[PDB]
Structure formats: structure tokens, C-alpha cells
Design a protein around this ligand. Sequence first.
Ligand SMILES: Nc1ncnc2c1ncn2[C@@H]1O[C@H](COP(=O)(O)OP(=O)(O)OC[C@H]2O[C@@H]([n+]3cccc(C(=O)O)c3)[C@H](O)[C@@H]2O)[C@@H](O)[C@H]1O
Ligand SMILES: Nc1ncnc2c1ncn2[C@@H]1O[C@H](COP(=O)(O)OP(=O)(O)OC[C@H]2O[C@@H]([n+]3cccc(C(=O)O)c3)[C@H](O)[C@@H]2O)[C@@H](O)[C@H]1O
Lengths: 189, 179
Amino acid sequence: ERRRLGVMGGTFDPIHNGHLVAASEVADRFALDEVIFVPTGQGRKVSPAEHRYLMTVIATASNPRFTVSRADIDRGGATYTVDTLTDLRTAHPDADLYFITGADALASILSWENWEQLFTLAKFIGVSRPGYELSSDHIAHADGLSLVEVPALAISSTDCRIRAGQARPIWYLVPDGVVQYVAKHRLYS
Amino acid sequence: RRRLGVMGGTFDPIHNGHLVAASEVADRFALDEVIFVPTGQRKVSPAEHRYLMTVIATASNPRFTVSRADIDRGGATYTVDTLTDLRTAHPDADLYFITGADALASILSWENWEQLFTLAKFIGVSRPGYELSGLSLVEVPALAISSTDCRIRAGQARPIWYLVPDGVVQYVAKHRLYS
Ligand SMILES: Nc1ncnc2c1ncn2[C@@H]1O[C@H](COP(=O)(O)OP(=O)(O)OC[C@H]2O[C@@H]([n+]3cccc(C(=O)O)c3)[C@H](O)[C@@H]2O)[C@@H](O)[C@H]1O
Ligand SMILES: Nc1ncnc2c1ncn2[C@@H]1O[C@H](COP(=O)(O)OP(=O)(O)OC[C@H]2O[C@@H]([n+]3cccc(C(=O)O)c3)[C@H](O)[C@@H]2O)[C@@H](O)[C@H]1O
């Protein structure tokens, strides 16, 4: 039972309060002393990695326990969580990793590259998300997976992008820094 | 003529639920400004803390202001008195009182409630938990957040990050409001 590092992977395009409240609640419920946010590397035109990274940095800046890693952005090619977990175990050799996933992402886990290997590298925490069933029953045939209720914020990055594309407000769905960053760099307009 | 939103509340504390509701209303009704009105004085926090949290929370939004009209008036806060005060202080403006679903059903038992609809139009915003049942109804993003849960999280040293604005997180900790 070594020290606990949270890991939250995502496109973060943009990062929103949904992601951040999930990470925060998990950090508290599992006494994580840090959460590492990992934007993924590069139909829909995903915003450039540097913008996704910077928005995530700005969004997490104010929280004492939140940091951001360039591991996936700097690796190049397809982002796979096995590679993300490999990298972070190398960077934090004496820590136990806790990969944080929302209900919709958890439900997809069997399609992930070398998915069996995931549970040799980290423990997984599924968090609730409005409009999705939180469940471990899809991998019942496989304390490597814990399910957690977090505050229900019905926010998606898709909705945030659509609003911003329509000049409709994204205030309070995303941190004030992200509102500014999105307007200044004209990310979805 | 100005189209003013009015969001009355205890705001103990103000949270993103309140703010996202006012933001969406401001957008859909093309309001020039939304005025947040903390009520005057179940141990509710002092008026000045509730006023200043609301000022800090609204500061960054270009279209949000805060009135101390109910604080300065003293005694029991009645929305008929709030709206008449704002009819005086902004005589050439249309008023829109924004209320959630939990408070919408209770309106029939507000002091002189029938007079409310001679001073302003009302906007009911959806809220998680409750059903949304002179008056318009608008869907807003569903943030299942309550002031009560926030106070409870604060008192148990659990995080209120991302449920309330960063400024309110700092203010609540600095002034030890629910500890
Ligand atoms: N409101 C909300 N409340 C609670 N949780 C919420 C949420 N909105 C999103 N989330 C969650 O936040 C996280 C970030 O979402 P989002 O920005 O869309 O990111 P997303 O594209 O869903 O990717 C989630 C993670 O899965 C990894 N993945 C995906 C596909 C394949 C493989 C592989 O190895 O083959 C790995 C990916 O690298 C990333 O780290 C997700 O886990 C999502 O469920
Ligand atoms: N997550 C959420 N999403 C969307 N809306 C949400 C919400 N949480 C609260 N709300 C709403 O935001 C508003 C502020 O909530 P909160 O701080 O709890 O405020 P609250 O104490 O419920 O009072 C709201 C207003 O009603 C007035 N009132 C109440 C009772 C009697 C009378 C009278 O004249 O006799 C007047 C009071 O003066 C204040 O202006 C409410 O309308 C609430 O429903």
C-alpha cells in the first residue's frame, strides 16, 4: 500500500467542471495527495494538443492537488492508456496509480489496447456521470475496480463546443480561465 | 428600455447552479443585466458574508451585478418589496424574476403574491431533483448542486471545488463560515 496518485486521462477539448468535480471527489474519497491530468495526443477536428494542454493547465492551476502531464502529447502516435500508465509508473516508481474514468469511458474498457494489462499497472475508479449507467458487470468475468458517486453535473465537452460555436455562454460549465482561453484563441468559432 | 433579470436568493453560499441558471436565462431572454439580490436576515449566515460571496462570485461576469436593497431595507425580506425598490431605482426597465423549480411551487404563499406579477414577469428554471411545474419556463444545464450540500461538505472538510466559484471556495475557508 504505497502512496496514491490519481490519473485522469482525456481529450479535454475543453476541460470542464464535470471532469474537475469528478477528480476532486475521488481525490477526497481515496485520500489521493495528487491527481495527474493527462491530455491525449492528436471526423471531428480535435483542437491542437498545445491548446488542450494549456486549457487543462489553466483549469487545474488553482487546485493544490492537481497537475498536468505532457506524457501522451509528447509520446506521439495513438494514445493508449497502457502507455500512459507505463510512463507514469516510470516517473513515479514508488506510487500506486489510480486511473479515473467516467461511466461512459469505463463501459468501453474492453475495446482498449491490451486492456487486460491495465489492471497490472493501476487500479481503476469509475465515477458516475448523468445520462450513463455506472456498472462493473461488463468485466465481472475478468480491489482493481471501484465505483464512486460524484456530484451530478450534466456537462459535456460536446455541449461546451456547440455553445461556444453558437456564441452561447459556457460560463460556470468550465472554469473562468477556460472561458477566457476559448474566447481569446477562437477555438470553436 | 433595459431588460433586467433579477435573481433573489439566500446565497449561503452562492454556487454554480445559481450562476449557470442566470447565465442561461440572460442568454435566452437577451437580458442586458442580471441583478442578484441576497435576502436580509436554520442559522443563516450573516447578511454581509452572503452579500460579499455573491459579489465575489459574480465579479468576473460582465452582465452580473448584486443589489444590497433587501439587506439595507431590514426586517423580513418580501419579493414585492424587492421588486418595488428596483422599479424605483431602475424606472425605465422590464424586470424578470428568475426562480428555480423548488421555489416556483411555493410562490403562492409569498406575501402579496398576486402583486408580484404586476411588477415583473417570472422565469422558472429547471433544477435536478424537482419537477418544473406572466410566467415563462426555461431549461438550463442540470447541475445537481445545493447550498445545503455545500455547507455540509464545508463543515465535514470535504471539497466544494467546482460546485462554487474559486473565489467562494477561498472566502468560505478564510472566514471559516460553516466550520
Ligand atoms: N460530467 C462528467 N462527470 C463525470 N465524469 C465525466 C464527466 N464528463 C466526462 N467525464 C469523464 O471524464 C473523462 C475525460 O473525458 P473526455 O475528455 O471526453 O476524454 P475521453 O475521450 O472520453 O477519453 C477518456 C480516457 O480514455 C482513454 N482511452 C480511450 C479510448 C481508448 C483507449 C485505449 O487505451 O485504447 C483509452 C483516453 O486516452 C482517455 O485517457 C472520461 O473518463 C469521461 O467519462
Ligand atoms: N442548482 C440549481 N439550479 C437552478 N436553480 C437553482 C439551483 N439551486 C437553487 N436554485 C434556485 O436559485 C434561487 C436561489 O436559491 P436560494 O439561495 O436557496 O434562495 P431562497 O432562500 O430559496 O429564496 C429565493 C428567493 O425567494 C424569495 N422568497 C422566498 C420565500 C418567501 C418570499 C416572500 O416574498 O414571501 C420570497 C427570497 O426572498 C429569494 O429572493 C431559487 O429560486 C432556487 O430555486
